[PDB]
mmCIF file of C-alpha atoms and ligand atoms in Angstrom:
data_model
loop_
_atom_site.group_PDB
_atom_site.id
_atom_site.type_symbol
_atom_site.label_atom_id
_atom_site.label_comp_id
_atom_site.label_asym_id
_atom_site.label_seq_id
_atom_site.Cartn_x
_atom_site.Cartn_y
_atom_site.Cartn_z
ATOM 1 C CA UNK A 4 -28.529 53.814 77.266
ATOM 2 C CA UNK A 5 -32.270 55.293 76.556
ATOM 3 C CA UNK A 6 -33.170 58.571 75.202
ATOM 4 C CA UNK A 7 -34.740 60.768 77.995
ATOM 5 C CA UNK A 8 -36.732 63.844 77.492
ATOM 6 C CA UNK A 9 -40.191 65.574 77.524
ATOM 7 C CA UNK A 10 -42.906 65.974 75.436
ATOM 8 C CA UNK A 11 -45.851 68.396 75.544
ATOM 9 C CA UNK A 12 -48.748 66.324 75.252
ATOM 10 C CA UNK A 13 -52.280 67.950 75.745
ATOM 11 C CA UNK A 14 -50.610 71.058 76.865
ATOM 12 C CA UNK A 15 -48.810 69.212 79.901
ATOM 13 C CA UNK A 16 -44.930 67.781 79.945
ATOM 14 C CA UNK A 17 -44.742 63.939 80.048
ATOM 15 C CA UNK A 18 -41.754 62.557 81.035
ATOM 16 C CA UNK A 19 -40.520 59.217 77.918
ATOM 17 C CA UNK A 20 -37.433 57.127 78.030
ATOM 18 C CA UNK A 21 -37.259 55.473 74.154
ATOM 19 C CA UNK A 22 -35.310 52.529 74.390
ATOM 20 C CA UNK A 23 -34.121 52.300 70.429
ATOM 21 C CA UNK A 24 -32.910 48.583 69.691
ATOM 22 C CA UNK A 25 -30.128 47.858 67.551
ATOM 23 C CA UNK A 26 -31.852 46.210 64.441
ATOM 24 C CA UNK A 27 -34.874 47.522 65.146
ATOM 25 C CA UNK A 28 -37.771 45.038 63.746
ATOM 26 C CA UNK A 29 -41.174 47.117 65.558
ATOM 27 C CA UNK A 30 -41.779 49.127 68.527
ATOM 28 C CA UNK A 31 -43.732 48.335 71.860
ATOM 29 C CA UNK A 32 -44.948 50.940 73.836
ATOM 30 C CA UNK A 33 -45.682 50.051 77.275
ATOM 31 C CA UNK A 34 -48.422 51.633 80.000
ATOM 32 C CA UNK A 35 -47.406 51.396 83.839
ATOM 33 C CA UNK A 36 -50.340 50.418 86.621
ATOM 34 C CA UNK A 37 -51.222 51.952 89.555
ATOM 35 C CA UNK A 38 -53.205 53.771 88.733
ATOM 36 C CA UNK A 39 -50.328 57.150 89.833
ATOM 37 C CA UNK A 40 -47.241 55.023 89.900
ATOM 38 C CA UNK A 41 -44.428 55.268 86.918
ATOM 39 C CA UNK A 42 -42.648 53.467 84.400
ATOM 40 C CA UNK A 43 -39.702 52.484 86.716
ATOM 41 C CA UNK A 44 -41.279 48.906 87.981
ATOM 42 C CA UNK A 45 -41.655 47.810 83.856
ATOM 43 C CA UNK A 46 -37.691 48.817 83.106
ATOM 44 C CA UNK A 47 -37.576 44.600 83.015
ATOM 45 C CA UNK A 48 -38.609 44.817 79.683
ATOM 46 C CA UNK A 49 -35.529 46.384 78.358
ATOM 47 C CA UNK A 50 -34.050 43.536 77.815
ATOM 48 C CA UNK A 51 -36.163 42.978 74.451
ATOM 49 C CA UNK A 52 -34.507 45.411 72.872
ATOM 50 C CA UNK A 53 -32.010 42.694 72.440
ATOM 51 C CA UNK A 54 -34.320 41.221 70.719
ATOM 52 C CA UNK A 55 -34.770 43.727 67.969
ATOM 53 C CA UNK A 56 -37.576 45.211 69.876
ATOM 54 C CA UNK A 57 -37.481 48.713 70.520
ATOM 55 C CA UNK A 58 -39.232 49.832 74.204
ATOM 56 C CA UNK A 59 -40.696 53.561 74.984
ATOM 57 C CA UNK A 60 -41.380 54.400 78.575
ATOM 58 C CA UNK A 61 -43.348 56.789 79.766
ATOM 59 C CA UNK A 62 -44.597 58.497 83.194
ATOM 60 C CA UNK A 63 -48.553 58.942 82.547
ATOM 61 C CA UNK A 64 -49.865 61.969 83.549
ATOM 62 C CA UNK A 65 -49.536 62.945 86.835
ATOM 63 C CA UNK A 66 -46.958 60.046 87.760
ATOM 64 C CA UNK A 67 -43.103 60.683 88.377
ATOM 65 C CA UNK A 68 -41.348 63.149 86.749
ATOM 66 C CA UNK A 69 -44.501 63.790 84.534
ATOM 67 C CA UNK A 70 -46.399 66.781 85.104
ATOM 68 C CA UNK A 71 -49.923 66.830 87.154
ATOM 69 C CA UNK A 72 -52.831 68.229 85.106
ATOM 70 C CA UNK A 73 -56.405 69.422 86.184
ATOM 71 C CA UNK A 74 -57.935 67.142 88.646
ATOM 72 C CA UNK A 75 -61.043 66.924 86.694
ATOM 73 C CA UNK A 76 -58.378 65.281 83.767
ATOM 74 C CA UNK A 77 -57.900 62.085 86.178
ATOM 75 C CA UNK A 78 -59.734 59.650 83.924
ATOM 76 C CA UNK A 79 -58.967 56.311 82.006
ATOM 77 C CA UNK A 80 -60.463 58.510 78.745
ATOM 78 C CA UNK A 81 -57.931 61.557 79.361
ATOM 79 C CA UNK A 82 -55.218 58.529 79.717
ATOM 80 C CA UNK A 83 -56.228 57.244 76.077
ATOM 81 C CA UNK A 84 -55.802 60.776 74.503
ATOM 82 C CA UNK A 85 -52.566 60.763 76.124
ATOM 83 C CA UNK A 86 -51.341 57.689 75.079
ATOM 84 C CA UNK A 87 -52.629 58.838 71.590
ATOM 85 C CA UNK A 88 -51.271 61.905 71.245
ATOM 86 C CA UNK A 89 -47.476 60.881 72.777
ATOM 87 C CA UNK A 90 -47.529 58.086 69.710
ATOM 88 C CA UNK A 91 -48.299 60.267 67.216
ATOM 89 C CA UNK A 92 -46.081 63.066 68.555
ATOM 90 C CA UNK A 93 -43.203 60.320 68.843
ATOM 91 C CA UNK A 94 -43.713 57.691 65.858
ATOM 92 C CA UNK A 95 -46.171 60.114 63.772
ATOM 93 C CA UNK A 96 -48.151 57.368 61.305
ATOM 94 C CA UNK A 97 -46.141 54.358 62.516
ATOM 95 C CA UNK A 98 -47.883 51.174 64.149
ATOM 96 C CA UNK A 99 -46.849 49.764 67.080
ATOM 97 C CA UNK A 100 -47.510 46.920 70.050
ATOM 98 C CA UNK A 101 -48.732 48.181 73.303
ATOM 99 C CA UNK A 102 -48.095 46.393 76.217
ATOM 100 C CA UNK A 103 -49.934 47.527 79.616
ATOM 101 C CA UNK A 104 -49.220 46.034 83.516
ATOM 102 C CA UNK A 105 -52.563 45.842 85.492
ATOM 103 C CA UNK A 106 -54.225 49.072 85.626
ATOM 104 C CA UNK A 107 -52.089 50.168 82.243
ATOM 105 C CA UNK A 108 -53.317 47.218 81.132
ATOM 106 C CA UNK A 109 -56.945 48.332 81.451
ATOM 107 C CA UNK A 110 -55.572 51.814 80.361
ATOM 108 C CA UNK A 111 -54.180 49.328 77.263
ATOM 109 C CA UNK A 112 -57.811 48.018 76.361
ATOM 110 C CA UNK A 113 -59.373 51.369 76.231
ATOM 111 C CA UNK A 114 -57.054 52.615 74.377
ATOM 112 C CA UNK A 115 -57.296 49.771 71.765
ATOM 113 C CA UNK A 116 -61.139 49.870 71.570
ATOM 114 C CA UNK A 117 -60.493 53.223 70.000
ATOM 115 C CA UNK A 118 -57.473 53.544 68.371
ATOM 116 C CA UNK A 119 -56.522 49.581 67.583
ATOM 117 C CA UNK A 120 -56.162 50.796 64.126
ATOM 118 C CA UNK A 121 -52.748 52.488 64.946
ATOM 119 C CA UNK A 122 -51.858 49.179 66.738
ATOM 120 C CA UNK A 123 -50.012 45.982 65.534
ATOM 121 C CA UNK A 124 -51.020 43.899 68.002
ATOM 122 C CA UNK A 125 -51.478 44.328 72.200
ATOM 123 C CA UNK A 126 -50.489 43.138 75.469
ATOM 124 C CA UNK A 127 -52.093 42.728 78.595
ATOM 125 C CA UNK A 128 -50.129 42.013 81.737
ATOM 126 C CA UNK A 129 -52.296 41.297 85.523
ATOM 127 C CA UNK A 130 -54.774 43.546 83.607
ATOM 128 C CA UNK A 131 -58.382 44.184 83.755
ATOM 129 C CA UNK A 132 -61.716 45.326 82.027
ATOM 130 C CA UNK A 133 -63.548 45.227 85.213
ATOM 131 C CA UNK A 134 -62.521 47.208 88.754
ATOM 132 C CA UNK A 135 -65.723 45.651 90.263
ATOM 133 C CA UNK A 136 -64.492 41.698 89.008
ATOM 134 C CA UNK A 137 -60.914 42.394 90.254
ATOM 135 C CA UNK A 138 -61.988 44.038 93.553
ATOM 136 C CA UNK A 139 -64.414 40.874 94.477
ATOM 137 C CA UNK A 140 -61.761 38.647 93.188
ATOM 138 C CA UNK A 141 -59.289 40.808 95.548
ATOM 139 C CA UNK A 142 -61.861 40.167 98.327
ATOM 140 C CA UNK A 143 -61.691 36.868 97.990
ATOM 141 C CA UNK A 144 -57.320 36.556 98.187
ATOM 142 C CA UNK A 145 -58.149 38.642 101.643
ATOM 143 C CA UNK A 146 -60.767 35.933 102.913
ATOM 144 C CA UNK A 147 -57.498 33.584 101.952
ATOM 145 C CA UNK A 148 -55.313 35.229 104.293
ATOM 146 C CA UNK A 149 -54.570 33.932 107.851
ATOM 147 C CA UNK A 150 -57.589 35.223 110.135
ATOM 148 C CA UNK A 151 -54.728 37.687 111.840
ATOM 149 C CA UNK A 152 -54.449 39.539 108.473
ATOM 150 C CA UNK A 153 -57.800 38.924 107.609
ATOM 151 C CA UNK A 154 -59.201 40.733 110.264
ATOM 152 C CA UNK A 155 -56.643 43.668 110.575
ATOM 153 C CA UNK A 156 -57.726 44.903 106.737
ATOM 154 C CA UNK A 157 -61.410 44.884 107.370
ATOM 155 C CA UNK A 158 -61.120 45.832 110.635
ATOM 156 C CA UNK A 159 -58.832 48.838 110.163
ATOM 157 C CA UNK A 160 -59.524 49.241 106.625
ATOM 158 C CA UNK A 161 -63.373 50.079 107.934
ATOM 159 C CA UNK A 162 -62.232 52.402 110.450
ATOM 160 C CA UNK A 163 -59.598 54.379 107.480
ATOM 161 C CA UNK A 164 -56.916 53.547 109.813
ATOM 162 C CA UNK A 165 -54.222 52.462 106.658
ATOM 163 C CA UNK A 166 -51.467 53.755 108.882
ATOM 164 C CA UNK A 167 -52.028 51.167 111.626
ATOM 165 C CA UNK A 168 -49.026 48.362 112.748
ATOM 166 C CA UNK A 169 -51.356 45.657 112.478
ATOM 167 C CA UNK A 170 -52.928 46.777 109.154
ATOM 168 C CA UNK A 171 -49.405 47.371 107.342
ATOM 169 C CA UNK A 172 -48.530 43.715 108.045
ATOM 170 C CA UNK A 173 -51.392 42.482 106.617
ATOM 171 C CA UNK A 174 -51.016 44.388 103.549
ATOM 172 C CA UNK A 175 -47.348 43.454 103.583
ATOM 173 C CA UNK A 176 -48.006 39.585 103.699
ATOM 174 C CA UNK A 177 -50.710 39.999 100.798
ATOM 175 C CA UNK A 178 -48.331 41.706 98.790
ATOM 176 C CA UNK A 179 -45.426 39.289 99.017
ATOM 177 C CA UNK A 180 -47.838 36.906 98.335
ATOM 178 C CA UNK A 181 -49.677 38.783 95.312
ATOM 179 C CA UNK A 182 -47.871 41.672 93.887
ATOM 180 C CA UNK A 183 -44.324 40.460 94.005
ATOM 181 C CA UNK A 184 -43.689 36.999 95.635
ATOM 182 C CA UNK A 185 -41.153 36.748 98.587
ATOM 183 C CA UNK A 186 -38.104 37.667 96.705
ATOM 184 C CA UNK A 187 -35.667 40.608 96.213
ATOM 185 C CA UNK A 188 -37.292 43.827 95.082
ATOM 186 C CA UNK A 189 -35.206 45.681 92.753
ATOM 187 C CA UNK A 190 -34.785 49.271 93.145
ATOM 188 C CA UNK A 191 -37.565 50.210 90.327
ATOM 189 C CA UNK A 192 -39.989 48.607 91.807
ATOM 190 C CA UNK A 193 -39.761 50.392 94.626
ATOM 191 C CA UNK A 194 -39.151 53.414 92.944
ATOM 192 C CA UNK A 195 -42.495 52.947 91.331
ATOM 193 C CA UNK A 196 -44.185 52.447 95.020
ATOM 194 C CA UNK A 197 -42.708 55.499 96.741
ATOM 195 C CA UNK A 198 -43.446 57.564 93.481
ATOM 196 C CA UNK A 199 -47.047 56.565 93.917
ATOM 197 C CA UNK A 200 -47.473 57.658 97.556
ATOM 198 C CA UNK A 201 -46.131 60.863 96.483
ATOM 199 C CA UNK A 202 -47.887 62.605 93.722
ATOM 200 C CA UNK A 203 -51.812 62.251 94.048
ATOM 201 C CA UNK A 204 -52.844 60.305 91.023
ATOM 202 C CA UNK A 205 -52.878 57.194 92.844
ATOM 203 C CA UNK A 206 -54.825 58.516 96.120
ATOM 204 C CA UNK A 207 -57.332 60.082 93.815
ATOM 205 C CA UNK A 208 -58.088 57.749 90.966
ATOM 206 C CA UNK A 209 -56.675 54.219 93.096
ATOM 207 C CA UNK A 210 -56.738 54.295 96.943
ATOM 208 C CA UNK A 211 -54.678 53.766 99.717
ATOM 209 C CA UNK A 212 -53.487 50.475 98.671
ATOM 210 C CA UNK A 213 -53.388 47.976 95.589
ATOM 211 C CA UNK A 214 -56.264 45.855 97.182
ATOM 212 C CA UNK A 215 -58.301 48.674 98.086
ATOM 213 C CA UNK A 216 -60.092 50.381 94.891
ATOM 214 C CA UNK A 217 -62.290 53.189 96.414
ATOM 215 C CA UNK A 218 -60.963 55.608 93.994
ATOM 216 C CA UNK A 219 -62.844 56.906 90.498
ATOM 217 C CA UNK A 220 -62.027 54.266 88.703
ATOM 218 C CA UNK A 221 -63.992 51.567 91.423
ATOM 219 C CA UNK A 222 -67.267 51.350 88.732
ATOM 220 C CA UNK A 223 -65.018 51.347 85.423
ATOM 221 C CA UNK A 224 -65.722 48.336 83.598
ATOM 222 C CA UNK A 225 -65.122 47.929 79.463
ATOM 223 C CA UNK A 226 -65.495 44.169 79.206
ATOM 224 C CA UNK A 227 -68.846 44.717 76.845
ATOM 225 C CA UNK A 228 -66.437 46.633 74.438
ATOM 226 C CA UNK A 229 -62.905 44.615 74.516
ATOM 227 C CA UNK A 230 -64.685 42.214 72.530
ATOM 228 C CA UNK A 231 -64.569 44.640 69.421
ATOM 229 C CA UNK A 232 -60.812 44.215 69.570
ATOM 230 C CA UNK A 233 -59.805 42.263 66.481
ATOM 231 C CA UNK A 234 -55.927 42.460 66.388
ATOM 232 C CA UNK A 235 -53.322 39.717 67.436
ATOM 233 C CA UNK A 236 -53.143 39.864 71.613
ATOM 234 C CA UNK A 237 -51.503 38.583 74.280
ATOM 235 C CA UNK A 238 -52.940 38.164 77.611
ATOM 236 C CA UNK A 239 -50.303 37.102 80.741
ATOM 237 C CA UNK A 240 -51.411 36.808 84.406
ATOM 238 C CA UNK A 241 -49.868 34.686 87.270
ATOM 239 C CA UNK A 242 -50.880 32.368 89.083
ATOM 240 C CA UNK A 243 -51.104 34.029 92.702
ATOM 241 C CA UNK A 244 -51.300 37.069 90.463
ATOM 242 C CA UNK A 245 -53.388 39.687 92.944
ATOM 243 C CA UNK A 246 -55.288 40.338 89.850
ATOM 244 C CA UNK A 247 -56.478 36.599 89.578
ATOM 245 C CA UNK A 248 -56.463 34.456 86.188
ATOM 246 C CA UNK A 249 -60.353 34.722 86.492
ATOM 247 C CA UNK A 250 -60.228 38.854 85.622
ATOM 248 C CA UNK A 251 -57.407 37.699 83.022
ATOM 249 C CA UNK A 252 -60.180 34.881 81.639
ATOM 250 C CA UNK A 253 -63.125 37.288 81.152
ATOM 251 C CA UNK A 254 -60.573 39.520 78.854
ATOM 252 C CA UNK A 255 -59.189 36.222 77.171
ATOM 253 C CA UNK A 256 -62.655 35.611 76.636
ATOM 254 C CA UNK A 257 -64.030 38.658 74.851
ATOM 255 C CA UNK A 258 -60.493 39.044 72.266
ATOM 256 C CA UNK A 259 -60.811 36.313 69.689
ATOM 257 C CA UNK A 260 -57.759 34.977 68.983
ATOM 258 C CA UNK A 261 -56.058 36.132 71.762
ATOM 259 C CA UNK A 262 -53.469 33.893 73.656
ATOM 260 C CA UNK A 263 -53.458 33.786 77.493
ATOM 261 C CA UNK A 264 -50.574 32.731 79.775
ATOM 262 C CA UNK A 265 -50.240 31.840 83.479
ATOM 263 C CA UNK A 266 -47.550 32.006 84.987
ATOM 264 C CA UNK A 267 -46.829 29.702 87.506
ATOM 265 C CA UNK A 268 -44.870 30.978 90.736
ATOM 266 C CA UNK A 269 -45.515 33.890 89.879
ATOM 267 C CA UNK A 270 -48.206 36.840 90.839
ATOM 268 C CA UNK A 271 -48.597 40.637 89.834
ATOM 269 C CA UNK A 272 -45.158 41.691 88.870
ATOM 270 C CA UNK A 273 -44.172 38.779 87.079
ATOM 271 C CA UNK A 274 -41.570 40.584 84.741
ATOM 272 C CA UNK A 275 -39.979 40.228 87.855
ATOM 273 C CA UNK A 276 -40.483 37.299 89.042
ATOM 274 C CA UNK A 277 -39.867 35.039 85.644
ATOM 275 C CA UNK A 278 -37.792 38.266 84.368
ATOM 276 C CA UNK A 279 -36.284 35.697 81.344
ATOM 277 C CA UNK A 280 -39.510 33.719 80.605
ATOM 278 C CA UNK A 281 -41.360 36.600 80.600
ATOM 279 C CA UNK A 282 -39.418 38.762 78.220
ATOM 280 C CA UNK A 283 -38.997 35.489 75.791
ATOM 281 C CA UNK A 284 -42.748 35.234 76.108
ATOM 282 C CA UNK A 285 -43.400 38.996 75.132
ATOM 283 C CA UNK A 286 -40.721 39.239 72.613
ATOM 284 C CA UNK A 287 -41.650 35.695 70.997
ATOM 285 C CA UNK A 288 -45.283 36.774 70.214
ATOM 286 C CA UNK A 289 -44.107 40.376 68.976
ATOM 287 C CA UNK A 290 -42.070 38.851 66.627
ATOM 288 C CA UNK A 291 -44.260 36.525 65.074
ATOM 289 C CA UNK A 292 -46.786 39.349 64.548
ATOM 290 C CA UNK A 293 -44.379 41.697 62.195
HETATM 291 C C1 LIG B 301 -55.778 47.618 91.882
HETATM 292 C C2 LIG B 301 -55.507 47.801 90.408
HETATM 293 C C3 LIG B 301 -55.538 49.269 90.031
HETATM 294 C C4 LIG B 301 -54.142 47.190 90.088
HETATM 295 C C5 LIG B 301 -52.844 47.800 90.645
HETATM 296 N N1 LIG B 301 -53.116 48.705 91.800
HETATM 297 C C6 LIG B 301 -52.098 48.524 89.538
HETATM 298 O O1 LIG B 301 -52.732 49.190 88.686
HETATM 299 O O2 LIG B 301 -50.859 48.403 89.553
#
């Protein structure tokens, strides 16, 4: 199995699971959403390491097992140095592909506008550059809902009342609908949930829900600077993804060169939900960027 263990990064211990492949041919670290939840829901990708890729995991700060620093440290920027300083502490001088899942993925862009140089090439999963873009886009995929549903998240969602009947089925339908499609949740998916509602990242720099931003992070928007991103990229998004193909476009846009996929049948969590094509996907543009 993976190497587990912490490291003191920043002064602070974050929990990393390095998944070391066999024939090792480059190294893809990977950035979990939420923002607050944990590397559990993105244990899909594994399976590259089959594929000569090796994986490293990580709980961001605050998140899981990971130790909670200063509230003031609850930023996208502190997330960066993180990321940064974990790499260098890990791999030292050594390149590597970074892959992030929505709000990782955003986590992902900032961190290649500043430090793409220590990057081989970078990944972008139901990501954004824009909470203001994906939270109208979000309001929109409410509007969709049946009126029922509709009604029950502004209605209660006005009033703060997140712990209503009537507003938990609405955001149950969106999600089954958007985040992971009416399937079979695996247990690390909803590891990565419950780990969320625990620990206060998420509350604090998220909200209540996925398609409810009111946290810090609700003006954060980087899509004037993504554009100075000049290395090979990969953007993936699904089709009912709840972080639409439009936020995906506006990133596609701004990366020349970059390649962006849709996934069809699919929505947030699609490493789930196409598990196979979206590991082959992942692992076939890694490896024709050595
Ligand atoms: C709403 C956005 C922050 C996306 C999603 N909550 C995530 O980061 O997993």
């Amino acid at each position: 199995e993976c190497i587990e263990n912490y490291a003191k990064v920043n002064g602070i211990y974050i929990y990393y699971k390095l998944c070391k492949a066999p024939e090792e041919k480059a190294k893809l670290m990977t950035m979990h959403g939420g923002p607050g939840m944990s590397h559990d829901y993105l244990l899909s990708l594994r399976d590259m390491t089959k594929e000569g890729i090796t994986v490293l995991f990580y709980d961001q700060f605050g998140c899981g097992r990971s130790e909670e620093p200063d509230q003031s440290k609850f930023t996208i920027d502190y997330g960066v140095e993180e990321a940064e300083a974990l790499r260098s502490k890990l791999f030292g001088n050594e390149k590597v592909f970074l892959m992030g899942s929505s709000y990782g993925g955003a986590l992902a862009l900032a961190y290649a506008v500043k430090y793409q140089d220590h990057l081989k090439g970078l990944i972008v999963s139901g990501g954004l550059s824009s909470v203001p873009l994906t939270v109208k886009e979000m309001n929109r995929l409410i509007d969709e809902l049946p009126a029922k549903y509709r009604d029950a998240i502004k209605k209660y969602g006005s009033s703060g009342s997140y712990e209503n009947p009537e507003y938990q089925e609405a955001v149950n339908y969106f999600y089954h609908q958007h985040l992971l499609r009416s399937e079979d949740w695996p247990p690390e998916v909803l590891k990565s949930l419950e780990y969320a509602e625990r620990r206060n990242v998420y509350r604090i720099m998220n909200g209540p829900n996925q398609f409810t931003i009111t946290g810090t992070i609700k003006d954060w928007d980087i899509t004037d600077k993504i554009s100075a991103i000049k290395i090979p990229t990969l953007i993936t998004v699904g089709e009912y993804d709840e972080v639409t193909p439009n936020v995906a476009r506006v990133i596609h846009e701004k990366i020349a060169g970059s390649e962006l996929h849709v996934f069809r049948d699919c929505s947030h969590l699609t490493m789930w939900e196409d598990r196979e094509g979206y590991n082959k996907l992942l692992s076939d543009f890694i490896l024709k960027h050595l």
